[PDB]
Scaffold this active site. Structure first.
Site, PDB file in Angstrom:
ATOM      1  N   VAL A  18       0.839  -1.199   0.000  1.00 17.12           N
ATOM      2  CA  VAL A  18       0.000   0.000   0.000  1.00 17.12           C
ATOM      3  C   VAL A  18       0.878   1.255   0.000  1.00 17.12           C
ATOM      4  O   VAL A  18       0.696   2.159  -0.825  1.00 17.12           O
ATOM      5  CB  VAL A  18      -0.953   0.023   1.211  1.00 17.12           C
ATOM      6  CG1 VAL A  18      -1.708   1.343   1.274  1.00 17.12           C
ATOM      7  CG2 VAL A  18      -1.931  -1.142   1.142  1.00 17.12           C
ATOM      8  N   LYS A  67      20.034   9.087  29.624  1.00 14.02           N
ATOM      9  CA  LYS A  67      20.982   9.933  28.913  1.00 14.02           C
ATOM     10  C   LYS A  67      21.523   9.137  27.731  1.00 14.02           C
ATOM     11  O   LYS A  67      22.326   8.230  27.900  1.00 14.02           O
ATOM     12  CB  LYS A  67      22.107  10.411  29.828  1.00 14.02           C
ATOM     13  CG  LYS A  67      22.897  11.568  29.236  1.00 14.02           C
ATOM     14  CD  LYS A  67      23.982  12.059  30.179  1.00 14.02           C
ATOM     15  CE  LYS A  67      24.649  13.302  29.625  1.00 14.02           C
ATOM     16  NZ  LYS A  67      25.265  13.048  28.292  1.00 14.02           N
ATOM     17  N   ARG A 106      25.614  19.480  17.502  1.00  7.44           N
ATOM     18  CA  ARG A 106      25.819  20.383  18.631  1.00  7.44           C
ATOM     19  C   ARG A 106      27.088  21.214  18.457  1.00  7.44           C
ATOM     20  O   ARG A 106      27.106  22.404  18.787  1.00  7.44           O
ATOM     21  CB  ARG A 106      25.889  19.589  19.942  1.00  7.44           C
ATOM     22  CG  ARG A 106      25.715  20.440  21.191  1.00  7.44           C
ATOM     23  CD  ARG A 106      25.944  19.638  22.460  1.00  7.44           C
ATOM     24  NE  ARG A 106      27.328  19.767  22.918  1.00  7.44           N
ATOM     25  CZ  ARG A 106      27.768  20.633  23.833  1.00  7.44           C
ATOM     26  NH1 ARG A 106      26.950  21.483  24.455  1.00  7.44           N
ATOM     27  NH2 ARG A 106      29.058  20.640  24.145  1.00  7.44           N
ATOM     28  N   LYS A 129      15.526  16.045  35.855  1.00 10.93           N
ATOM     29  CA  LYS A 129      15.091  17.420  35.613  1.00 10.93           C
ATOM     30  C   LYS A 129      13.919  17.765  36.522  1.00 10.93           C
ATOM     31  O   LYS A 129      12.989  16.976  36.640  1.00 10.93           O
ATOM     32  CB  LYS A 129      14.627  17.567  34.166  1.00 10.93           C
ATOM     33  CG  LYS A 129      15.712  17.336  33.127  1.00 10.93           C
ATOM     34  CD  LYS A 129      15.111  17.258  31.732  1.00 10.93           C
ATOM     35  CE  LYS A 129      16.078  16.637  30.736  1.00 10.93           C
ATOM     36  NZ  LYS A 129      15.452  16.434  29.395  1.00 10.93           N
ATOM     37  N   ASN A 160      25.361  19.900  34.487  1.00  8.28           N
ATOM     38  CA  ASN A 160      26.267  19.526  35.568  1.00  8.28           C
ATOM     39  C   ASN A 160      26.175  18.022  35.764  1.00  8.28           C
ATOM     40  O   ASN A 160      25.106  17.435  35.559  1.00  8.28           O
ATOM     41  CB  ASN A 160      25.896  20.235  36.875  1.00  8.28           C
ATOM     42  CG  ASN A 160      26.136  21.732  36.825  1.00  8.28           C
ATOM     43  OD1 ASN A 160      25.391  22.507  37.427  1.00  8.28           O
ATOM     44  ND2 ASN A 160      27.178  22.148  36.119  1.00  8.28           N
TER      45      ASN A 160
HETATM   46  N1  LIG Z   1      16.821  12.886  27.993  1.00  8.14           N
HETATM   47  C1  LIG Z   1      17.753  13.850  28.122  1.00  8.14           C
HETATM   48  O1  LIG Z   1      17.485  14.859  28.730  1.00  8.14           O
HETATM   49  C2  LIG Z   1      19.084  13.690  27.511  1.00  8.14           C
HETATM   50  C3  LIG Z   1      19.429  12.483  26.901  1.00  8.14           C
HETATM   51  N2  LIG Z   1      20.611  12.321  26.333  1.00  8.14           N
HETATM   52  C4  LIG Z   1      21.516  13.290  26.297  1.00  8.14           C
HETATM   53  N3  LIG Z   1      22.730  13.048  25.686  1.00  8.14           N
HETATM   54  C5  LIG Z   1      21.251  14.571  26.866  1.00  8.14           C
HETATM   55  C6  LIG Z   1      22.073  15.768  26.929  1.00  8.14           C
HETATM   56  C7  LIG Z   1      21.502  16.801  27.529  1.00  8.14           C
HETATM   57 BR1  LIG Z   1      22.277  18.505  27.758  1.00  8.14          BR
HETATM   58  S1  LIG Z   1      19.902  16.417  28.120  1.00  8.14           S
HETATM   59  C8  LIG Z   1      20.009  14.772  27.487  1.00  8.14           C
END
Ligand SMILES: NC(=O)c1cnc(N)c2cc(Br)sc12
Ligand SMILES: NC(=O)c1ccc[n+]([C@@H]2O[C@H](COP(=O)(O)O)[C@@H](O)[C@H]2O)c1
Ligand code: NA
Ligand code: NA
Length: 322
Positions: free
Chosen positions: A40, A119, A140, A290, A89
């Site tokens: 399709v 991450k 980046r 976060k 950080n």
């Molecule tokens: N999920 C996320 O916030 C996240 C995942 N993978 C990464 N390499 C990064 C880098 C920053 Br800066 S945030 C983030």
């Protein structure tokens, strides 16, 4: 012997086909739940190709046909980041993470919920959309200036060419090469007498920095997006909501995220995914924590170097866990 389509009919039909093909591709690649069989999709794709052949003016840079690659660049133009791609950080211990929470609670004056995410260890990318259309893809670089790899990122099938709504937004995430694809690629390179890639990050970087998009298209790359440079056009009021909204409008997002109500819950998440790390088909270098509420993120703000509302807990390197 007259052609069936007028230009106006062809223009409208091309628009219809692109919308439908973009939907099907999203289902197939991102949702991993195609609503239609390949025949399709292939049938409608051919119809679009034939329209574009007869009416080249109707070819849009974001059309599904522009995905397959073939274009070769002379070099990459620089890609400035008007809003910097900041780095977080880092934390390494339970002490570092609980201390982070203590500093957050001190600044805010109450307990704070955290959106916890993996991450992803690949190449950081920024994807620019204008009125819902993909217009720039960038690495980046140093966080202020990267490379314009728009054409290469078009070949990455999880990257949407059009969103569900005509918003302008700058979406950030990672592009990576799955572990299984990396090992296969390295063997292919070995047999070709080419230098192997040290790891999947270098393999993803090598792939996205190739000038010949045909080569890039042959590589297996994927994406996870997790934020935007400016939440102005977004409805989301929290990070968890932002991830849902990015998924809703057509981006691939990571399904392992969790909203945690205390730092003790955050710790359990860290422990959980250290154990799950080896089972994932993509590499991670840690956990991002976060403050969930955007109101509280805004209150906390940034230091000169990084956000005061987030921390990255770093695991041992992938190479240390075989
Ligand atoms: N999920 C996320 O916030 C996240 C995942 N993978 C990464 N390499 C990064 C880098 C920053 Br800066 S945030 C983030
Ligand atoms: N079943 C679907 O909805 C769907 C969507 C996109 C691609 N595909 C398949 O993936 C392959 C490549 O297609 P594209 O280069 O347009 O992504 C083809 O075999 C095609 O049939 C299937
Ligand atoms: Na590919
Ligand atoms: Na494990």
């Amino acid at each position: 012997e007259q052609q069936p389509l007028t230009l106006t009919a062809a223009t409208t039909r091309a628009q219809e086909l692109r919308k439908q093909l973009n939907q099907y591709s999203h289902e197939y690649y991102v949702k991993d739940q195609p609503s239609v069989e390949d025949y399709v999709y292939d049938r409608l794709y051919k119809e679009l190709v034939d329209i574009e052949t007869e009416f080249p003016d109707l070819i849009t840079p974001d059309s599904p046909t522009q995905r397959v690659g073939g274009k070769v660049l002379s070099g990459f133009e620089k890609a400035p980041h008007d809003i910097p791609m900041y780095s977080l950080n880092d934390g390494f211990s339970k002490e570092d993470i609980f201390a982070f929470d203590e500093r957050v609670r001190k600044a805010i004056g109450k307990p704070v919920a955290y959106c916890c995410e993996l991450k992803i260890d690949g190449l950081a990318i920024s994807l620019r959309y204008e009125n819902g259309v993909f217009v720039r893809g960038a690495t980046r670089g140093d966080g202020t200036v990267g490379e314009n790899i728009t054409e290469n990122l078009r070949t990455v099938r999880s990257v949407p060419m059009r969103l569900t709504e005509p918003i302008s937004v700058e979406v950030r995430g990672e592009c990576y090469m799955p572990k299984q694809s990396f090992v296969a690629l390295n063997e292919e390179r070995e047999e070709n007498g080419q230098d192997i890639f040290a790891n999947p990050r270098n393999a993803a970087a090598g792939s996205l920095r190739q000038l010949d998009t045909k080569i890039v298209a042959k590589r297996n790359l994927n994406t996870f997006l997790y934020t935007v440079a400016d939440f102005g056009p977004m409805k989301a009021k929290t990070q968890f909501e932002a991830l849902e909204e990015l998924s809703a409008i057509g981006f691939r997002t990571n399904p392992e995220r969790q909203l945690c109500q205390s730092i003790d819950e955050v710790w359990a998440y860290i422990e959980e995914y250290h154990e799950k790390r080896s089972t994932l088909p993509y590499e991670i270098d840690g956990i991002v924590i976060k403050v969930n509420e955007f109101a509280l993120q805004d209150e906390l703000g940034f230091t000169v170097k990084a956000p005061r509302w987030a921390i990255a807990y770093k695991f041992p390197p992938e190479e240390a866990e075989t």
